[PDB]
Amino acid sequence: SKIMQLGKYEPMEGTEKKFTFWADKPGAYWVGEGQKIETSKATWVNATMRAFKL
Amino acid sequence: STVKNEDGTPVNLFEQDMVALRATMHVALHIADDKAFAKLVPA
Numbered sequence: 001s002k003i004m005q006l007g008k009y010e011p012m013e014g015t016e017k018k019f020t021f022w023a024d025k026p027g028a029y030w031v032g033e034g035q036k037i038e039t040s041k042a043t044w045v046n047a048t049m050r051a052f053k054l
Numbered sequence: 055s056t057v058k059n060e061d062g063t064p065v066n067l068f069e070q071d072m073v074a075l076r077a078t079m080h081v082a083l084h085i086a087d088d089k090a091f092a093k094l095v096p097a
Contacts, residue, residue, distance in 0.1 A: 036059075036069050 012051070019047040 010017065024043030031037050057065045067074055085091075 031071075034070050034072060036066070037071065 010049075012049075015051045017049050019049075020044055021047070 021044060022042070023045045024041065026040035026042055028040070029038045055064045059065060059070075065072065
């Protein structure tokens with residue numbers, strides 16, 4: 001199998017698999033002495049794959 | 055709450071990166087005899 005040759009394997013117990021990855025990373029602000037530090041935010045995203053029977 | 059930013063918002067020590075010292079004391083006073091005191095004053 002050329003797919004089994006080139007691709008990456010993944011251990012998969014069930015008929016379905018879930019992946020989650022980082023997507024957004026927090027910003028950063030210059031703040032004056034004693035200024036209010038603005039907030040920032042992290043984010044992730046999900047993907048999934050399923051099996052078929054030959 | 056007793057000190058205000060330029061914009062008028064109260065100071066937040068965490069969000070604004072500040073430190074503050076509070077000192078407190080309790081004190082009590084009693085005059086045991088109101089007659090026991092006298093005063094000399096210029097005319």
